[PDB]
Write an enzyme that holds these catalytic residues in place. Sequence first.
Site, PDB file in Angstrom:
ATOM      1  N   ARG B 135      -1.443  -6.620  10.953  1.00 53.15           N
ATOM      2  CA  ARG B 135      -0.417  -7.159  10.057  1.00 53.15           C
ATOM      3  C   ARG B 135       0.618  -7.989  10.828  1.00 53.15           C
ATOM      4  O   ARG B 135       0.560  -9.211  10.837  1.00 53.15           O
ATOM      5  CB  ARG B 135       0.273  -6.005   9.331  1.00 53.15           C
ATOM      6  CG  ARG B 135       0.846  -6.366   7.969  1.00 53.15           C
ATOM      7  CD  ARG B 135       1.195  -5.105   7.200  1.00 53.15           C
ATOM      8  NE  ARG B 135       2.036  -4.216   7.990  1.00 53.15           N
ATOM      9  CZ  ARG B 135       2.547  -3.071   7.546  1.00 53.15           C
ATOM     10  NH1 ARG B 135       2.301  -2.665   6.315  1.00 53.15           N
ATOM     11  NH2 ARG B 135       3.330  -2.346   8.331  1.00 53.15           N
ATOM     12  N   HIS B 165       2.613   0.415  14.074  1.00 54.45           N
ATOM     13  CA  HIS B 165       2.323   1.059  12.813  1.00 54.45           C
ATOM     14  C   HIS B 165       0.834   1.363  12.795  1.00 54.45           C
ATOM     15  O   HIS B 165       0.030   0.540  13.228  1.00 54.45           O
ATOM     16  CB  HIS B 165       2.699   0.135  11.655  1.00 54.45           C
ATOM     17  CG  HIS B 165       2.648   0.800  10.316  1.00 54.45           C
ATOM     18  ND1 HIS B 165       3.404   1.910  10.011  1.00 54.45           N
ATOM     19  CD2 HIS B 165       1.904   0.537   9.217  1.00 54.45           C
ATOM     20  CE1 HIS B 165       3.124   2.304   8.782  1.00 54.45           C
ATOM     21  NE2 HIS B 165       2.218   1.487   8.276  1.00 54.45           N
ATOM     22  N   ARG B 218       9.418   6.980  10.892  1.00 54.06           N
ATOM     23  CA  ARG B 218       9.729   6.248   9.680  1.00 54.06           C
ATOM     24  C   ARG B 218       9.055   7.003   8.542  1.00 54.06           C
ATOM     25  O   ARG B 218       7.858   6.863   8.288  1.00 54.06           O
ATOM     26  CB  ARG B 218       9.204   4.828   9.815  1.00 54.06           C
ATOM     27  CG  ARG B 218       9.645   4.183  11.135  1.00 54.06           C
ATOM     28  CD  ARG B 218       9.306   2.703  11.192  1.00 54.06           C
ATOM     29  NE  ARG B 218       7.863   2.460  11.141  1.00 54.06           N
ATOM     30  CZ  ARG B 218       7.045   2.549  12.181  1.00 54.06           C
ATOM     31  NH1 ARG B 218       7.511   2.888  13.366  1.00 54.06           N
ATOM     32  NH2 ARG B 218       5.751   2.307  12.035  1.00 54.06           N
ATOM     33  N   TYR B 264      -5.061  -3.521 -30.804  1.00 54.44           N
ATOM     34  CA  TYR B 264      -5.738  -4.785 -30.551  1.00 54.44           C
ATOM     35  C   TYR B 264      -7.252  -4.681 -30.424  1.00 54.44           C
ATOM     36  O   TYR B 264      -7.779  -3.758 -29.804  1.00 54.44           O
ATOM     37  CB  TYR B 264      -5.150  -5.431 -29.298  1.00 54.44           C
ATOM     38  CG  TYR B 264      -3.746  -5.922 -29.524  1.00 54.44           C
ATOM     39  CD1 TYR B 264      -2.692  -5.515 -28.697  1.00 54.44           C
ATOM     40  CD2 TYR B 264      -3.463  -6.812 -30.570  1.00 54.44           C
ATOM     41  CE1 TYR B 264      -1.390  -5.990 -28.906  1.00 54.44           C
ATOM     42  CE2 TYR B 264      -2.171  -7.287 -30.786  1.00 54.44           C
ATOM     43  CZ  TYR B 264      -1.145  -6.878 -29.949  1.00 54.44           C
ATOM     44  OH  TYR B 264       0.110  -7.405 -30.133  1.00 54.44           O
ATOM     45  N   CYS B 310      -0.446  -1.615 -25.573  1.00 59.63           N
ATOM     46  CA  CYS B 310       0.251  -2.867 -25.825  1.00 59.63           C
ATOM     47  C   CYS B 310       1.331  -3.112 -24.771  1.00 59.63           C
ATOM     48  O   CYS B 310       1.543  -2.299 -23.867  1.00 59.63           O
ATOM     49  CB  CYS B 310       0.861  -2.838 -27.231  1.00 59.63           C
ATOM     50  SG  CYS B 310      -0.376  -2.598 -28.511  1.00 59.63           S
TER      51      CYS B 310
HETATM   52  C1  PDD Z   1       6.227  -0.544   9.237  1.00 61.77           C
HETATM   53  C2  PDD Z   1       6.174   0.646   8.329  1.00 61.77           C
HETATM   54  N1  PDD Z   1       6.751   1.788   8.787  1.00 61.77           N
HETATM   55  C3  PDD Z   1       6.731   2.920   7.991  1.00 61.77           C
HETATM   56  C4  PDD Z   1       6.117   2.973   6.717  1.00 61.77           C
HETATM   57  C5  PDD Z   1       6.145   4.269   5.938  1.00 61.77           C
HETATM   58  O1  PDD Z   1       4.812   4.675   5.662  1.00 61.77           O
HETATM   59  P1  PDD Z   1       4.531   5.859   4.716  1.00 61.77           P
HETATM   60  O2  PDD Z   1       5.061   5.584   3.358  1.00 61.77           O
HETATM   61  O3  PDD Z   1       3.042   6.039   4.620  1.00 61.77           O
HETATM   62  O4  PDD Z   1       5.185   7.074   5.275  1.00 61.77           O
HETATM   63  C6  PDD Z   1       5.457   1.760   6.254  1.00 61.77           C
HETATM   64  C7  PDD Z   1       4.549   1.675   5.012  1.00 61.77           C
HETATM   65  N2  PDD Z   1       4.761   0.577   4.072  1.00 61.77           N
HETATM   66  C8  PDD Z   1       3.905   0.406   2.863  1.00 61.77           C
HETATM   67  C9  PDD Z   1       3.428   1.735   2.242  1.00 61.77           C
HETATM   68  C10 PDD Z   1       2.663  -0.493   3.141  1.00 61.77           C
HETATM   69  O5  PDD Z   1       2.448  -1.066   4.150  1.00 61.77           O
HETATM   70  O6  PDD Z   1       1.830  -0.585   2.090  1.00 61.77           O
HETATM   71  C11 PDD Z   1       5.555   0.573   7.063  1.00 61.77           C
HETATM   72  O7  PDD Z   1       5.024  -0.627   6.637  1.00 61.77           O
HETATM   73  C1  PDD Z   2       5.360  -7.561 -33.493  1.00 66.04           C
HETATM   74  C2  PDD Z   2       4.932  -8.677 -32.590  1.00 66.04           C
HETATM   75  N1  PDD Z   2       5.121  -9.940 -33.050  1.00 66.04           N
HETATM   76  C3  PDD Z   2       4.741 -11.003 -32.266  1.00 66.04           C
HETATM   77  C4  PDD Z   2       4.125 -10.868 -31.003  1.00 66.04           C
HETATM   78  C5  PDD Z   2       3.734 -12.113 -30.221  1.00 66.04           C
HETATM   79  O1  PDD Z   2       2.334 -12.107 -29.997  1.00 66.04           O
HETATM   80  P1  PDD Z   2       1.689 -13.158 -29.072  1.00 66.04           P
HETATM   81  O2  PDD Z   2       2.241 -13.053 -27.693  1.00 66.04           O
HETATM   82  O3  PDD Z   2       0.222 -12.879 -29.037  1.00 66.04           O
HETATM   83  O4  PDD Z   2       1.965 -14.525 -29.626  1.00 66.04           O
HETATM   84  C6  PDD Z   2       3.863  -9.519 -30.544  1.00 66.04           C
HETATM   85  C7  PDD Z   2       2.993  -9.165 -29.340  1.00 66.04           C
HETATM   86  N2  PDD Z   2       3.562  -8.256 -28.346  1.00 66.04           N
HETATM   87  C8  PDD Z   2       2.792  -7.813 -27.148  1.00 66.04           C
HETATM   88  C9  PDD Z   2       1.882  -8.919 -26.569  1.00 66.04           C
HETATM   89  C10 PDD Z   2       1.936  -6.520 -27.430  1.00 66.04           C
HETATM   90  O5  PDD Z   2       1.929  -5.903 -28.446  1.00 66.04           O
HETATM   91  O6  PDD Z   2       1.184  -6.133 -26.373  1.00 66.04           O
HETATM   92  C11 PDD Z   2       4.367  -8.421 -31.317  1.00 66.04           C
HETATM   93  O7  PDD Z   2       4.309  -7.122 -30.841  1.00 66.04           O
END
Ligand code: PDD
Ligand code: PDD
Lengths: 382, 382
Positions: B135, B165, B218, B264, B310
């Site tokens: 990384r 790391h 860490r 849906y 949704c």
């Molecule tokens: C440089 C560094 N030190 C320390 C940690 C802490 O690790 P852990 O959560 O496993 O104790 C991370 C993890 N980061 C995130 C999780 C990553 O790289 O996805 C890190 O990138």
């Molecule tokens: C009551 C209502 N009217 C209008 C819309 C607009 O739809 P569209 O983005 O397809 O034009 C939504 C959709 N909402 C989100 C997408 C849902 O229910 O996951 C809605 O819940």
Amino acid sequence: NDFHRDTWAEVDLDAIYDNVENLRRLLPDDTHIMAVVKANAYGHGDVQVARTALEAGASRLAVAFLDEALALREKGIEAPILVLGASRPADAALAAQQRIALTVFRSDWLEEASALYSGPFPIHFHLKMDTGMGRLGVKDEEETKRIVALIERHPHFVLEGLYTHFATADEVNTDYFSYQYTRFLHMLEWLPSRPPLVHCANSAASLRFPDRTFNMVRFGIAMYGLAPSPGIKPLLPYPLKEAFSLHSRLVHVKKLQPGEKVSYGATYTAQTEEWIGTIPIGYADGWLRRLQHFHVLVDGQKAPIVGRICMDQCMIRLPGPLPVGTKVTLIGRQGDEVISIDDVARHLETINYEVPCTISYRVPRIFFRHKRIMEVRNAIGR
Amino acid sequence: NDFHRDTWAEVDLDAIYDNVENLRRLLPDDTHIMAVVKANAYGHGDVQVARTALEAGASRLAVAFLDEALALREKGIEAPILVLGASRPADAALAAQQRIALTVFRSDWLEEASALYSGPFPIHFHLKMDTGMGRLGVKDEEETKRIVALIERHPHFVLEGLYTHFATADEVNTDYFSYQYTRFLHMLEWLPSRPPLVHCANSAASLRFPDRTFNMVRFGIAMYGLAPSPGIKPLLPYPLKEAFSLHSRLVHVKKLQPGEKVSYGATYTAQTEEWIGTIPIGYADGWLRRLQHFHVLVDGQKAPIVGRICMDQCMIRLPGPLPVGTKVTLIGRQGDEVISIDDVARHLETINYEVPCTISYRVPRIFFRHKRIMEVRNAIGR
Ligand SMILES: Cc1ncc(COP(=O)(O)O)c(CN[C@H](C)C(=O)O)c1O
Ligand SMILES: Cc1ncc(COP(=O)(O)O)c(CN[C@H](C)C(=O)O)c1O
């Protein structure tokens, strides 16, 4: 707003404006356009999109729940806002005070609101009718009549409109869609008098059957330039303009020898001498781990993501030694290459809707309008 | 802070405190604990967790990029902060001014910062060494010696520490881990003198081999009560206390007749007369569509999500007619039943790390301490 990590999304408000303006042309001059800007405008920026939509011909706005409407009010929006979801009867006064219309579908909700609210501000209600979605809305006449009466009885309760929502308007086959539309015309008959605002159409329904939209359409996904579904893409009246793009920059570049491993689990092994670049974006930014075998755009070419995606960073295999700071496009276009939200959705095995909503609060949004940078929006900014 | 939708996450700070205190006991008194609170504390609330960790024994904090450190500063955190990722050379002065330590792994970055920064505040750097993660970090001695010199030359540049790391510390087989650990000791020899702070261990490594942690660890994922991996679950020195739980409430309850469809695509069909509940949480809240065949807890029993999820709501089949307002738990326990982050991670086919980070800004965080509600944190609040 300013930001200190070379990762940012860009929202083209000119695209949003054109998508809405074009619908304004397609619809009958008597028909209202209600811009759906819930979930921070499907991840594009609530106030920025709301303003552009109003500017392009939208007269009203719609959000998911109360908090989303109050935020718009605080940011300075004065247009009417409708809460499409559920709300607490105890919040009726707040909604009335802020000029926010509420969705209602239960008679017992009104009984509660009545006992709690006396005035002086009137509350505009929109009656939801369930015609086959099975989400929210009344189902029978008895319950329907009961609701109308309670609203009628209260001096500050007003029935501004009533509506339904379609579950399959983006399906090429319109069998279920027709059943729902017919069910709607039947249930509207349960009302003593037709409210001033009758609506039912979403992006797909309004773009496909603009003549069956009544007084108002609720414009969502298509306003952002995304097709409700790949199936109806070849049936859309005008071309949609995608407004969302996502970018980052190389922060490290190195050459790996054959046999050297990359990332967690050491699941990737360099087959030969290769250039690996590291970019500052990870799953905490919405670039989920499932995008592990996807490709990004760098210097105009597709570069594969190698190894597992980390929380804040991920690596890609580069064409050769590129300079640190080189721009990487994850969603958008570079030269002749392009990656759309539909491409990311396909790989993630989801629908386009879900992608921009998932790009997190950690990713600043830069807005463009009139071909110029309008403003920057960094959630975790100062 | 206040919120107007019946959907919220609860963070138990007592758990966080216990997980950290237990490590403080396990490690040598001379070993520092740096709490990793990037990504808004893995979705738990950056400042709330940071204060508790410092209270429990941590002495320093770590974030992913500059913006995250600044926010902690604005929110009143005075403890030392280290930015683990990349940063811009032009931001060196801002970091130095705010007492934020930076990670460095390129000599050309230092060339740039030198030319732009003159003082008077000193900048504390931590040299990142790549030992197999692929990384960030230096890989060779020439580049390493070069960085040390540049730092030495500038009067306001201080090499406070150096680290690496691990990519596989959470794997039962310690083959790759040993190679990396051995590579580290070898590269440390490249330094003219050992910086006051040598570190390399993350949660997994520090809990398994607390004797090989050097001066600082860490602590990340384990601080939140989550196991680095299921494989090392049975090898953890002490039981971890899960701190995150997610809840909602029924906003609608109805009875479907056999044949009625839901959501849906109308992919779900009631087989018989059943009670469907609707809850105010969807994929814009982080409850991804992929959880479509999962279940939630209601009234102490498991209730299957039905139809597609949704953006802001989803439906679940209920044991029978329950009152609207009935509490639903998506992550946490109800009576004898429980759903852990690990359960959700399994269904989504990812690791626990990714789940709390994806619960979006739309979901308010309620903090508990000493078994009492401490505060509420609504991102989209007033
Ligand atoms: C440089 C560094 N030190 C320390 C940690 C802490 O690790 P852990 O959560 O496993 O104790 C991370 C993890 N980061 C995130 C999780 C990553 O790289 O996805 C890190 O990138
Ligand atoms: C009551 C209502 N009217 C209008 C819309 C607009 O739809 P569209 O983005 O397809 O034009 C939504 C959709 N909402 C989100 C997408 C849902 O229910 O996951 C809605 O819940």
